[PDB]
Design an enzyme around this catalytic site. Sequence first.
Site, PDB file in Angstrom:
ATOM      1  N   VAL A 218       0.861  -1.162   0.000  1.00  9.57           N
ATOM      2  CA  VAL A 218       0.000   0.000   0.000  1.00  9.57           C
ATOM      3  C   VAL A 218       0.905   1.222   0.000  1.00  9.57           C
ATOM      4  O   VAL A 218       0.599   2.236  -0.629  1.00  9.57           O
ATOM      5  CB  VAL A 218      -0.882   0.040   1.296  1.00  9.57           C
ATOM      6  CG1 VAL A 218      -1.877   1.206   1.245  1.00  9.57           C
ATOM      7  CG2 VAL A 218      -1.615  -1.295   1.522  1.00  9.57           C
ATOM      8  N   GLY A 219       2.024   1.120   0.722  1.00 11.21           N
ATOM      9  CA  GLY A 219       3.045   2.161   0.734  1.00 11.21           C
ATOM     10  C   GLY A 219       4.157   1.932   1.748  1.00 11.21           C
ATOM     11  O   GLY A 219       3.889   1.666   2.925  1.00 11.21           O
TER      12      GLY A 219
ATOM     13  N   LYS B 100       2.552  -4.122   9.029  1.00 10.49           N
ATOM     14  CA  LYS B 100       3.561  -3.071   8.944  1.00 10.49           C
ATOM     15  C   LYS B 100       4.933  -3.635   9.374  1.00 10.49           C
ATOM     16  O   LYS B 100       5.092  -4.120  10.494  1.00 10.49           O
ATOM     17  CB  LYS B 100       3.185  -1.897   9.851  1.00 10.49           C
ATOM     18  CG  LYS B 100       4.187  -0.737   9.825  1.00 10.49           C
ATOM     19  CD  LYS B 100       3.887   0.295  10.894  1.00 10.49           C
ATOM     20  CE  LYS B 100       4.461   1.656  10.521  1.00 10.49           C
ATOM     21  NZ  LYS B 100       3.842   2.791  11.307  1.00 10.49           N
TER      22      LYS B 100
ATOM     23  N   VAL C 128       3.734  -0.811   4.671  1.00  6.49           N
ATOM     24  CA  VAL C 128       2.584  -1.690   4.844  1.00  6.49           C
ATOM     25  C   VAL C 128       2.221  -2.543   3.670  1.00  6.49           C
ATOM     26  O   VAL C 128       2.163  -2.072   2.550  1.00  6.49           O
ATOM     27  CB  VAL C 128       1.272  -0.904   5.150  1.00  6.49           C
ATOM     28  CG1 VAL C 128       0.248  -1.838   5.738  1.00  6.49           C
ATOM     29  CG2 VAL C 128       1.504   0.330   6.071  1.00  6.49           C
TER      30      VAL C 128
ATOM     31  N   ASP D  80      -2.873   5.595  13.314  1.00  4.49           N
ATOM     32  CA  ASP D  80      -1.401   5.496  13.106  1.00  4.49           C
ATOM     33  C   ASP D  80      -0.529   5.997  14.246  1.00  4.49           C
ATOM     34  O   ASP D  80      -0.456   7.194  14.531  1.00  4.49           O
ATOM     35  CB  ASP D  80      -0.980   6.149  11.774  1.00  4.49           C
ATOM     36  CG  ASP D  80       0.375   5.671  11.279  1.00  4.49           C
ATOM     37  OD1 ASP D  80       0.585   5.717  10.040  1.00  4.49           O
ATOM     38  OD2 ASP D  80       1.224   5.248  12.108  1.00  4.49           O
TER      39      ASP D  80
END
Length: 344
Positions: A27-28, A45, A30, A160
């Site tokens: 996703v980026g 993560k 993660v 987060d």
Amino acid sequence: ERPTFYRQELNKTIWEVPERYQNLSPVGSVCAAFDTKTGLRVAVKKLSRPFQSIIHAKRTYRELRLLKHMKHENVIGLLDVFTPARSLEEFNDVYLVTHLMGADLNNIVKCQKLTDDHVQFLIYQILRGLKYIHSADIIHRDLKPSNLAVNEDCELKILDFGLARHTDDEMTGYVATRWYRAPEIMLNWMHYNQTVDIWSVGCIMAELLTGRTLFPGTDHIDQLKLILRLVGTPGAELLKKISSESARNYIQSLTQMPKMNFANVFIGANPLAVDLLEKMLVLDSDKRITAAQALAHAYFAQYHDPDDEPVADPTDQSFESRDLLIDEWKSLTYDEVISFVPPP
Ligand SMILES: CCCCCCCCO[C@@H]1O[C@H](CO)[C@@H](O)[C@H](O)[C@H]1O
């Protein structure tokens, strides 16, 4: 006791995970996956270079502790935490697992027009876990639409940690979306407030109403101008900003800005909502409304029930004021991964 793992390279990085996590998908940092044990979509993560310095080490322990500790319906919970390593000596990589929700404020707002009753429920839910986080003396410093997951039943979770700090902690300067971010941060105040998060909610909440980004800067001075165009230049108290005597004279150099009437800007909004924003978007963090007081605000009448607006538990932040070497932080951390107890 130790599941079979399996390494695979995802995007220039290695990823050794237990085989109950299938279909890792970046996703980026993660991946998204599907957990066979339980059959829920999850988000893994991998922490980026933990234990690289005395400060990362500290950073890592802290995050992990916090996640272990958060147990609130509106705050994300740690599903799992693991490492490939078979002992403390080879121990060097750390992965966190959490539930993947379905959506978030980031994307539901790009495509649906939210009516006021929507907004109420959502903002109240955000506020209600902020009341929970702030009780642990924690400022989550990265409130923003994509870090607010929502799901089908419209439940909301705040997402987060990592940028989160304990309140009397000398504040450091950091990478993130400037749009939702309090002025005092943007001026690098060494110390600051839990009300910095209230500024975000303020911003997030006006975006829900209007459909648009409240303060869509393109750099810090553009960000700072956009802000003043709305709340108006501040009075002389201003001496306060010694923190930056190079930033002080650049505000005093700025053209003089009248404070706008919020009711002339947010056309069609509930007057109760517009009132609540007026108490969230004050530059003086002393006069800025707290999460708790905000939960008491009449806007939330329909949802407000103190007895299901709980506070967080007795914790030890003791470590915050310790100086240990990397290897100390390393062990402390390792132990926590071992001692992890997984929810049922
Ligand atoms: C656009 C100009 C920015 C205005 C300055 C921000 C004012 C925020 O408020 C300041 O924050 C500090 C810590 O949170 C407090 O200790 C100060 O007493 C308080 O005045």
